Amino acid sequence: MVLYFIGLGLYDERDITVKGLEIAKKCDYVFAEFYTSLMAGTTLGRIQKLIGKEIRVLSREDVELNFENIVLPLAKENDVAFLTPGDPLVATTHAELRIRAKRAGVESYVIHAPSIYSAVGITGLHIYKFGKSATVAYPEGNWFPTSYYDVIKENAERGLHTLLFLDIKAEKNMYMTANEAMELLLKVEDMKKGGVFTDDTLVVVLARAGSLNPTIRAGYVKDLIREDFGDPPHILIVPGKLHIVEAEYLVEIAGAPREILRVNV
């Protein structure tokens, strides 16, 4: 008996690691959630075909409120796998599920998969230069989230890049675009007026990482705010001070304005 947390990766069913696949194929029961992220290059059917098992999809409520009632019971007498997009423990609250497993007397194992958190390396920005990360959440009712703005401010003051996860409402089939995130940031800027995010701010957009042809674009907010970056998911990055080689890659690979090559040391 055992419970495996297995990541499926960034874009399609083949982003799962060989290790994850060989283990999932031999499990007795397979569960999964698809609300923490969007795998734009595959379908439940294609994933089921690859693993050769029927997959029971769980909702956020099933997991957060009933993981110990739906999954763990079976894990006490069978080999069970719980699949998630990307890496199962990145930008999710699934780590806490391992504590539930322990209390239920179930041993758990984690199988990693490519995560957007490290895939941003394809933007050419040095991974070690990324600071604190944040999530741009959709405003709801009278509540308008703004914490992500302070994160950018804090990182930028230290010359660090800021990775911005974008909101997702899987049940409503809503996936926040980089465009919508930029619009929200501009509104927060008008409020706090910190000079953190304006029309002249350089940003980087990465869409559908994991696919063979992801959209990688760099430029000023005023020019990219209404640009079509293709289907979701999207992630937005606000670079800090750039190293020359970072600027070169942004220009050569992400189509950034050649003027950024002239860094102000």
Element of type H or E holding 187: helix 178-192
Helix (H, G, I), strand (E, B) or coil at 55: strand
Determine the Cα–Cα distance for residues 17 and 33; give it in Å rounded to an integer: 18
Q: Are strands 234-238 and 202-207 parallel, antiparallel or unpaired?
A: antiparallel
Residue 21 interacts with which of ligand SAH, a copy of itself, none, CB < 5 to 8 Å by class: a copy of itself
The response to whether 94 counts as a known ligand-binding position is: no
Residues whose CB is less than 8 angstroms from the CB of residue 140 and which lie 6 or more positions away in sequence, other chains included: none
Q: Is 87 annotated as a binding residue?
A: yes
Among 45, 52, 73, 121, binds a copy of itself (CB under 8 A): 121
Token pair belonging to 117:
């958190």
Instruction: Measure CA 204 to chain center.
Output: 15
23: Cβ contacts below 8 Å, ≥ 6 apart: 4, 6, 81, 111
90 is in an annotated binding site: yes
Question: CB of 7: closest distance to ligand SAH in angstroms?
Answer: 7
Using CB under 8 A, which residues numbered 169 to 228 contact a copy of itself? 209-210, 212-213
Q: Is 126 annotated as a binding residue?
A: no
Q: What is the C-alpha to C-alpha distance for residues 239 and 217, in angstroms, rounded to an integer?
A: 13
Amino acid letter, 181:
A
Question: Within 88-107, which residues bind ligand SAH (CB under 6 A)?
Answer: 90-92
Check residue 126 for interaction with a copy of itself (CB under 8 A). yes
Residue 234 touches ligand SAH, criterion: CB under 6 A: yes
State yes or no: residue 135 binds a copy of itself (CB under 8 A).
Answer: yes
Select the span of 59-67, 91-99, 186-194, 217-225 touching a copy of itself (CB under 8 A).
Answer: 91-99
Judged by DSSP in three states, 257 sits in coil
The answer on whether 166 is annotated among ligand-binding residues is: yes
3-state secondary structure of 140: strand
| Strands 174-175 vs 168-169: parallel, antiparallel or unpaired | antiparallel
By beta-carbon proximity to a copy of itself, the closer residue of 60 and 222 is 60
**Residues in the site for a copy of itself, rule: CB under 8 A?**
7, 9-10, 12-19, 21-22, 50, 86-96, 98-99, 102, 109-110, 112-115, 117-119, 121-122, 124, 126-135, 154, 158, 160, 165, 209-210, 212-213, 245, 248-249, 252-253
Applying CB under 6 A, which residues contact ligand SAH?
Answer: 10-11, 36-37, 85-87, 90-92, 115-117, 165-166, 168, 206-210, 233-235
**Where is the binding site, in residues?**
10, 87, 90, 115-116, 166, 209, 234
